[PDB]
């Protein structure tokens, strides 16, 4: 019932000079032209979708080429449509989530295998990988977080969890989620409540409220939609430096106006250049792209 | 069970210098600035949102800006909510959907209310106003339509439709669902076949496929997508003229780069201005702003 | 003493799969790939220098790659160095001055022998081309213009004059300068009073002042910064739609935020889709995009 | 004649949150916010101009405005106009070049003397300050950087060189030009040989060439755009990382492509973090950014 199996999961490579939406397995991987190198020069990063959805969304496309239009990024968008159930909502979503999620930790030990032929045979290190979830997806990236530890290959750079899933992971241990042990630098992205948690998971943990989104509807009507703005968000920080500017988690937080580069950080890719660390609250606009703040810090 | 009542209804009016999202009712409308003239100037545009929705989403919203932006548009956004069973998803959709359809008429008498009373004591010309409508809004603006005619107004300029609802409409009467004949030209926006339909409806069908929006994941699982993407479509055409061209439905459509405005029409507030009726291709793009084409025409 | 003479002038032709930066001549034309086919589909835009430059400088160079990024544009740049005495700058400016200026209409014809060529040859419709030219090259372009009348091949579709040479020229009459009725649509942008001139030449006229550009410096040590800054100008506005809005030219010109397409007109290459006519106002930034507007109309 | 004196020269100081384009003197500058303050916890950077210009230029501005919108940067950009004969620009450019080439010296101990300040009662140290000149505000530059030594404060962490003036320097003894000796760390940036000079004056030598910059025109027609090339792609630096990488200097010069931080070096704030020393060659492109690789190392 929506199973698993490396056979099953694929990805799509796109680099600046690559957007050929083919799809590839373990196998036909070295058929890419970036992969015909003996070295891969480029920043990597690893894209995987959570629960019922899939590599080719809008969404998770749109993200892929806010990174390979930057220059040096080879995108590995990681589907598992089949293991994520996406192939057959059926009836009884709370036993498929569960299937899904049980399966996290398997994609993930795919993106470690994934890695260690990155590493190894490309010889990409690790200083250079990145790795982007949603949902359950982020779980699946922290599982691979761990994997490679385990692997002997040291952690990856950063672990970005969009929207952590929050039923079957909020009060799991750190060894069954995403956890700020399982990079160097894992990043958070909370936005929905039910579908995600508030529960701090990382480095640093974005409060872009962080429950019902502006512009996306009633409190849990639009639940669906507040869960989706974390992938949303995301790409806008990746396009634009510093489009949301968080400030130290507080009652009464600061503006953003009163920022500075010592106690707010510039929610995406370069979050971690920022010393500030913990939970921050970050205020949103109602429609794209919801930027917080003109200036940068 | 998800009512319908005059008093219930609400409308949020915008105009370039009047973003007050708040709410008004055919009591506190003329409480509005712009409508504490003796003569309205601008163009006027309903936006109507279909079935388990509501006005002020970010679509909508963003529908709204588009057209107010450009000057001398004054926006009224239809809310009916309550009569579209937003606020009760409590189980069995197919009863709802019922209601909400069956309620579609009187939201239309409705608009029609507020358009005698545009015309008569605003004097705002027919020929000024247009009307949009999603799913069963789209059936909701045809009964307008068909209201003022009967009022003795005789016909608004346009209607759009976007993606209306097909399930209870696609095989009515004219008289029963939006039709053709509704207005002195009727723009339809085909871009799912299960929720919307692909019957021929208007004046003008652009099919932009229509159905399985790209972008939206799988076939079926990606149907509310492809469903709200007639939403997003038009607002891009709003903002940046021949987004989209379309080209005579063809068993081999010809590519858009060989449009001239003789057998093509850009989709928009400006396609009856191309002469070119009937039903139309469309290929679109996997993520905003979609656009199929550089070129104007 | 700084010669004018056909062979000395070249060309570069840039399209988006082929930016060689290879010049050619009316000889080494044909030998170009984009004119090995027996048609050329492409929107045509000459670009033209003016007094001592060159057709490989950065700025127009940069307005060459806005056109050709735009997907259907074949651009020429007309490189007229020696007639427009680049190749000699040994003192007495205002003698050169007055040399590079009599070899305008020659330059002129050159350009209209290779619009002939177009035509005739590729089945080039005059509706698809357009001619840029700066200082010297605006006056120049003119010349193209007329030369084309003359040659029975109609109009071309618009002639963009960024600032116009004034002296020797903003008193001769319609036939000895670029003139409102050079082409269908004709474009000025005014942004130099010394090196340019205020007087009236198009069938539209933006003054972006226009004089002492934002940022150039002392009003007469900057001159010659102001006088290029309509090349800059141009190029943003073909980056970017809007970039630069014209209001009706005022003692007190209203504001852009308050403007409409039917009284202001977007600066660019769809300008003359905006139906006021005659001179028009435009404020500026003192920085790249100088953009005044993030609306468009 | 073309006279120096400190009341003359002025400072324009620049804070994310000040962009006041006001002017201050070694007297009203405590009436700046910024310096109302016990300590200054900025990294603070001086932009000196050269022969004929001015600390509002263009291109100066612009800087200023990458550096500051970095976060933690006071931007004091020096303006001695007066002294480096811009008010007067009448005729003989060799003497007055002669004059503005003495005051050199006049207008380094000036920003020595404005540094003594904020290192003995703003607290600022040495490590954290930056000199940045263009021309001959390269050499005021390294002039300061000798007083503060002999004001015994220690040296300045970095002095930045762009395009140093050649003429009355090219040969001069290391006390009477800017030097390798004068910070911690000394980048040249070399793009003019006419204007600038060829010979080796840092820490590090970048040779964009280093003369005729690509897309400024013909070889001593575009010397002066060449000669100002250095302002804007150091300026580009600051902006994007690695947008310029430099290196070895040979008679066959490796690509950028094969670069790593181990013999290349991305020319910037950032360079003296690069290993390698000594002369680099830099490939450039034509066109704003000018960027020679997409990578970072
Ligand atoms: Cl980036
Ligand atoms: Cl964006
Ligand atoms: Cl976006
Ligand atoms: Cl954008
Ligand atoms: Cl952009
Ligand atoms: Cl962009
Ligand atoms: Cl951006
Ligand atoms: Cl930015
Ligand atoms: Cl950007
Ligand atoms: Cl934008
Ligand atoms: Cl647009
Ligand atoms: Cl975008
Ligand atoms: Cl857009
Ligand atoms: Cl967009
Ligand atoms: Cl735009
Ligand atoms: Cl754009
Ligand atoms: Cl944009
Ligand atoms: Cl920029
Ligand atoms: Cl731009
Ligand atoms: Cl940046
Ligand atoms: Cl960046
Ligand atoms: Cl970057
Ligand atoms: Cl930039
Ligand atoms: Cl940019
Ligand atoms: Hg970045
Ligand atoms: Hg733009
Ligand atoms: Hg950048």
């Given at each position: 019932?929506?199973?698993?199996?490396?056979?099953?999961?694929?990805?799509?490579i796109?680099?600046?000079?690559?957007?050929?939406?083919?799809?590839?397995?373990?196998?036909?991987?070295?058929?890419?032209?970036?992969?015909?190198?003996?070295?891969i020069?480029?920043?990597?990063?690893?894209?995987?979708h959570?629960?019922?959805?899939?590599?080719?969304?809008?969404?998770?496309?749109?993200?892929?080429?806010?990174?390979?239009?930057?220059?040096?990024?080879?995108v590995?968008?990681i589907?598992?449509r089949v293991?994520?159930?996406?192939?057959?909502?059926?009836?009884?979503?709370?036993?498929?989530?569960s299937?899904?999620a049980?399966?996290?930790?398997?994609?993930?030990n795919?993106?470690?295998?994934?890695?260690?032929?990155?590493?190894?045979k490309?010889?990409?290190?690790?200083?250079?990988?990145?790795?982007?979830?949603?949902?359950?997806?982020?779980?699946?990236?922290?599982?691979?977080?761990?994997?490679?530890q385990e692997?002997?290959?040291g952690?990856?750079?950063?672990?970005?969890?969009?929207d952590?899933?929050?039923?079957?992971?909020?009060?799991?241990?750190?060894?069954?989620?995403?956890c700020?042990?399982?990079?160097?630098?894992?990043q958070?992205?909370?936005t929905?409540?039910?579908?995600?948690?508030?529960?701090?998971?990382?480095?640093?943990?974005?409060?872009?409220?962080?429950?019902?989104?502006?512009?996306?509807?009633?409190?849990?009507?639009?639940?669906?939609c507040?869960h989706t703005?974390?992938?949303?968000?995301?790409?806008?920080?990746?396009?634009?430096?510093?489009?949301?500017?968080?400030?130290?988690?507080?009652?009464?937080?600061?503006?953003?106006?009163?920022?500075?580069?010592?106690?707010?950080?510039?929610?995406?890719?370069?979050?971690?250049?920022?010393?500030?660390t913990?939970?921050?609250?970050?205020?949103?606009?109602?429609?794209?792209?919801?930027?917080?703040?003109?200036?940068?810090?």
């Open positions: 019932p929506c199973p698993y199996s490396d056979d099953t999961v694929k990805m799509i796109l680099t600046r000079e690559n957007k050929k939406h083919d799809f590839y397995t373990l196998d036909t991987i070295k058929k890419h032209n970036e992969f015909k190198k003996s070295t020069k480029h920043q990597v990063v690893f894209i995987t959570g629960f019922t959805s899939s590599a080719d969304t809008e969404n998770f496309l749109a993200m892929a080429k806010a990174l390979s239009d930057k220059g040096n990024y080879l590995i968008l589907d598992w293991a994520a159930c996406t192939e057959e909502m059926s009836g009884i979503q709370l036993a498929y989530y299937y899904a049980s399966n996290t930790r398997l994609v993930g795919y993106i470690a295998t994934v890695t260690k032929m990155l590493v190894q490309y010889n990409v290190p690790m200083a250079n990988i990145r790795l982007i979830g949603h949902s359950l997806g982020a779980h699946t990236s922290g599982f691979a977080g761990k994997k490679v692997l002997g290959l952690k990856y750079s950063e672990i970005i969890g969009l952590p899933a929050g039923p079957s992971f909020k009060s799991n241990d750190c060894s069954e989620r995403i700020k042990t399982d990079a160097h630098y894992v958070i992205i909370h929905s409540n039910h579908l995600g948690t508030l529960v701090t998971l990382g480095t640093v943990d974005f409060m872009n409220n962080g429950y019902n989104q502006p512009g996306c509807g009633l409190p849990l009507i639009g639940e669906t507040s703005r974390a992938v949303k968000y995301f790409t806008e920080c990746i396009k634009h430096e510093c489009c949301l500017i968080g400030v130290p988690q507080s009652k009464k937080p600061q503006p953003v106006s009163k920022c500075t580069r010592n106690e707010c950080v510039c929610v995406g890719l370069n979050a971690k250049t920022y010393p500030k913990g939970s921050f609250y970050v205020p949103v606009e109602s429609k794209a792209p919801y930027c917080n703040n003109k200036g940068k810090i």
